[model samples]
Target: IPRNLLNAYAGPNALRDYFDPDCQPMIPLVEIPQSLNPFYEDGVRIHAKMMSMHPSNNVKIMPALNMLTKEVQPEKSKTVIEYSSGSTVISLALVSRINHGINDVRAFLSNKTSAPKLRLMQFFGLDVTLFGGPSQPAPNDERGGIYRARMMAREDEAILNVDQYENDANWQSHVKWTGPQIHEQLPSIRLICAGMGTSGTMTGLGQYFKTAKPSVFRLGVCTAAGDRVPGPRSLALLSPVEFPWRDSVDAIEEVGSKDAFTLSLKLCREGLICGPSSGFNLQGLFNYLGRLKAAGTLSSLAGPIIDCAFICCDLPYPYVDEYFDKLGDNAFHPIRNQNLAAVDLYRYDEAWELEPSSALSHFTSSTHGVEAVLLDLRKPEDFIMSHIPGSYNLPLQSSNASTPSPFTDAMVLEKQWKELEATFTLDRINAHDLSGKDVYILCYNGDTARVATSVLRAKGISASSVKGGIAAVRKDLPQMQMAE
Candidate 1:
């Protein structure tokens, strides 16, 4: 919890005693303790008593939502083996004991490999017998890994897979367990931003929140993102994916590669020890919050912000050994989530589609038509080497964090307008203001400009917003020829 981990994994508690008599390394691998209750204050309190953290912050703990069987016995296993490409397997291994799948998998691969998952299973008193794996499955996307596990379950004997992705128990655990705790803790929460594995977290929480707080926004996060891996393409593009969990949850947003590695490392330097998954989720969260903040759309209650919260999808325990020593505080793996952006200001009709530039991972449709004149505000810091060629630089000196600015002051706003008009065209705004001409506003991320555009529109300026902002502009603007 002290560090925003760079990856999502749970490793053996290095401090634990070894169970394997044949093992050279005396340390044993163990699953995340499932017995701890994520609900009860006392249960988590008891866990807090046993867990270890950096000596600098010994008492701090992840606000863990323990989903173990709780009152129900941990549902132990006799002689079981499980698979692991990611965290879901850890849970599935824990529950496999009861599913008969644990006792049932003689047909699947035996658990005897030198794999960490198998070793941990054996350490747990699971009579894991290994079969094969000098080689491994090509790194499939996360869900594909789950499907592979299920496929393997078809053959293994005495093999049990908790099937975290498809398991009713997984959904049940979070809904009955995780959701309630969040409610008990932050019942007033209006939005939940989370990275995804099974959509279990988002779905379970989303379903509950829909009833608990209908207006709550469910931003689902996903892995194996960007062009290299399969994206949400099979999602909204192919067809509207509607799993039961999909009901209240927003469609999955790429949280894996898009922001994980590079962005995680970037924030890690800022002293946030989050794993890459958390980076993906938080980047999205910040993009959303930053926009709202810049646009002055955030409702300023008298106290702390009441709207947004990100539920860390998983822990980075497995990464401590690998990345901890090798990488500096400025390091975390990078992954990409990208989309094609439409930079076509060539005429709304001529423009076909848009894709995102590297800086902008996602975009919203703000298709410019003859109905409006779009202004791309430039900044001196970034986006200058590339920007909308004809866009305006409508920048204002920003105020301090926690302090709101008078963004709507007519005089001040007009002054900023003058500056932008110099570059965007002095008469552009006057034409719109006096003649009810249509105008479109934009900024690096489309947050501020869009908001300002809306504000202007509200004042009968006939304004609209350019989705994706300046970040999008840089991506789509066909590189200009400026050689002397």
Candidate 2:
């Protein structure tokens, strides 16, 4: 049969090579361990369909790939354009490479997009252009990134704008693929919880469930007003331009930034380690459950058992530090304290001491083979931006070690320790780097450094906490060369 480039996506085989499963498997639909959420006592179960495990490290690949590969023509003469700086750009670049020629994929990013996100998109070989800032319109706004992209498309006949905001393929991908997977995985599905980004996931899932199993509840999660959660747009700020399925959602719930981050921290403790949007979605889920419990309909759903699931969109490691850094000591203190109070974790007045001056001195001077490894237990973005010279970071937390907990049974703690130990290997850390070296642990604050120092000491490694953590070292060595 002769291939028709005009309508390439008529069959699934058209996408077989580009949508290679070998790169990453269909994302897992794992149940959120009941320990992660307190609502389990009421016989409620929540699952997280982990989507971060994708090669592009986000669920955006599902829609982005579908839009680029299936919707857009694979024309070497044309340059595919999208107004994005985050995960979508990365996915588009990857799809361009796998489906068509790699050179023509381009992204129009906001000037405020993070350095890491910009770098990642570039690493995928995207032709990225930084546009408007705070003084200019936001991405989905009328005079924003969309306008710039549309203008470019108008100017160049070769430019084909892939408007993700308005495209049916965005939601169609989820409806035909992602939504069905959820129902297939949990045949007894009752509720679906997800945040509103492009509104693809909710819209698709809502459409399917609202008709197929009208009994199934579709809950939409969004950031509360004035709180800027990345990925998903807040209800107050989300316009019809970005989210056409706003009203199609069964119910919309707002999650606070503090609550989202706090629960996200708990998710890290539970070993989920999902991005902030996932945290926001979970907060929304709990809020919805609370409402049901209050309304005396907690167990009113007449089914085999009321099981719900939420989408864990991306891994949080890259964005954690930036988020926490903005929310400084005063702002972060209250919620963090509340989070710690709920768990068995403790705070020590004095850390297992080693002055930043001494550590700096050891690194600066060729002080006679005092092999020291600065154990940085911060998030990826933080450690990537700056860290002590020759320090290798195997963060104690999934993202950053903002707060420490999980103190329960000795057996459980031991398992967590073993998992932590297994996370770092010699091959991962360049083999002989930390062997027979004095380990100095550091976190965002000095607290986790003490806990880590004890863990290392228990393992008989010559280790101690940095006197005041990264905060102290940054102040003392203002001239410290940041890691590239």
Candidate 3:
């Protein structure tokens, strides 16, 4: 019984063995930090079963592997189709390619799927066919993607539809792998909770615990009535589901997108790194426990010392923006130096640049009927020493350049450009009657002046940068008139 000490696969079928779930070790079962567990003072310890650590980085990998290995006939079917736009189909695409050598994996999903999700399927090289209707249509509905996938598979022998919604293998995979793993990992476990999407995870785990350890309680989490939190179905929506989930689940709790995403952000910050569905599952557990405590039925069913665990389905990267959209700015820390967001937004033009001698003449002479103004972009202390006779001083603050060139760090250039505009207000510009007047800009170096020129031009003011800044101006016109 020699083990895989290196955890490396060699030989011709290396990839095939690597993808095999049986060959891989158990997924992680981690205890949440004390701060994340609201039930910690109540003598309850909560653990997150990290199924996101799988090779595909999702819980669907288990069902995808099981369906492909147990049901799919690689020689008979050239294409494997599924009605999923997320983890399941993505896992199917990857598992099919490595295990069965099946390259023609197709995803039949709702047209309402986000562009990011559609592109994600394409990123995995899966052929996608979008169906127009309710995003999560009933399985029997003719307009639904599930029905379409089923019909298409029936008509073509080369096409195989591993229907996750109705497939026994989907739940059986969890019964065979996930349930056993959790039980072995936590023998003191009193209850298990998970988001009931397609009811595969719950049904499988429920059935396993029912037979293996009848005392273990099963809690199924679903989306709130009107709100949507990807993966899990609302209680009303679960009415049409064909799975025998009712028999498996001991209790059901509803969680909204706001709570789900809020808790997800918290878990992510705490280093758990899970998605909204994972948060939904964990929050559902907390809600259920709170109700039990309020009813004074805490020790009756769950025992005096409650040990509970919830499934962490996937990572938060794909749903990162959804968290912000659901929770708003309050859920996250305010971004530092927000002005940087508005920097470098305008275009640069070569015509806006001026040579030192030409700039000196422009500063002293009139363009058409309007007189020119010299705007010196330098520190007040530097400008106090010596500058053009009537030039306006508006300092462009910037960090000392790490490289010899001033433009080495784009952030420094952006900060300097924004700083120039912050002080060069419209009221200040109008105070000097700068509107319709040609403005010549000068800085320590010409590069900073170019950025300032671009900023001024964006405000509808006519401006030009002195080509080599004050250095070139002093070198080209050493005898030019100056004021202390």
Candidate 4:
């Protein structure tokens, strides 16, 4: 049992013990929502082995820890090098620092890597060297970062290169932890799927199940032949890989970048919170099942309830913008009144506000021989049902009440204000000649009325907002004074 019920580690080796494979509990194995599982109706149950929940928050951390502990000679090697721009190098850099106290962790990546990815490695304090060539270089290519890293390690014994593509420890880590855990959690599991990057994940899981549960089908997902979705290698790119992934994998499925990103976005929205590689993996499982279903062989594979599991390797935050890039703007909700962000630079005054009773009195009585216009800023439906007599309706559209206040966010406010302008158009305001009369703005609440008042005053119109809006007005005025 753990010393702390809260799973907290204490003392000198606390951090080290926290990351140890033996000390840590099994990561979560959660069933994805039925909405995401298209095979649910076919008696298939899909579960995600959430490797993203690891201490380093990615699947690569498992192999990173294993390689550092088993392969690196920490006493002589103070520097660690790897040819990766994504989770693998980032995980290695973090694990090396925490486990081996190796501070000089370096990443040799292709120059084609995005600025955000470069900065991400820098954020982890990894020494990054960019090589000008194909981002996904062949293992044996002399000009590639992988070959350079290996050569540098050979020249300087003090520098260690834990080459993930060829390292046995990489696959062994998954075999030791991931495979056993999933088998123990879901003993009925019939299929396992993972996006093949270094191929370590699938190779190890495949090897483990081959011995422990030989009946289990191992499905490897790859990026489509010519497409790119970070982390997973395409079928063509896998040729130069040195891992014994061919023997381990029972089948291979290709997924396009757009489909991967689209599914990943849906997963995030549905609370899975996984990245594109995860989506790629799951899509592979779906694709495999679809083929099996089409051939009418799905039922022959296993029991009535065929259990399938896929690896969720990392979170989606790093590739957020890529989702919009691949799926396009049509995939997301638009920010209405985006121009309102610029126009909200108006002045406000407490003197420009009025109590509901005072505002009602102003509507009945004139000052300086100018009649006050009661401009109700509620929805037309609300205004039609009950409003101050003689008040003009001008709705200020807002998002659902369940959503957080737009005032709390500038972008949301901009959208809300844009919608307000849509309903409270300049043409409609001009129709009432609001510049010549005193305008008293009334909304459901005082907050929105104040915003309207500010815009009107900025337009050189004499405007004032009713405090607490219609709520306060109803409290102060008698029902007989109200109109239907």
Q: Per-residue alpha-carbon lDDT of model 4 for 76-176, expressed as tens digits?
A: 87889899857898898778877888889889989988999889999989889999988888889898999989999999979899899888999999999
Which 10-residue window in model 2 sums to the lowest lDDT? 1-10
Kindly report which residue stretches of model 3 are placed more than 4 angstroms away from their true locations once superposed: 1-5, 301-304, 345-442, 445-484
lDDT of 3: 0.83
lDDT of 3 by residue, 119-210 (tens): 88899898888888788888898878899899999999898998998889999999998998899889888999998888999999999999
What's the distance in Å from true for residue 169, model 3? 0.4
The TM-score values for the models, in the order shown, are 0.40, 0.62, 0.77, 0.73
Question: What's the C-alpha lDDT at position 175 in model 3?
Answer: 93
Q: Arrange candidates by TM-score, descending.
A: 3, 4, 2, 1
Candidate achieving higher lDDT, 2 or 4: 4
Model 4 misplacement above 4 A = 1-5, 345-484
- C-alpha-based local distance difference test score of model 4: 0.83
* Alpha-carbon RMSD of each model: 24.7, 17.4, 7.9, 8.9
Q: For candidate 2, lDDT tens digit of each residue in 266-333?
A: 67668787888888889999998899889998887538567898988888887878667645465454
Model 1 error, position 216 (Å): 1.5
Residue 482 in model 3: lDDT: 47
lDDT for residue 199 in candidate 3, whole number 0-100:
90
Clashing pairs in 3: none
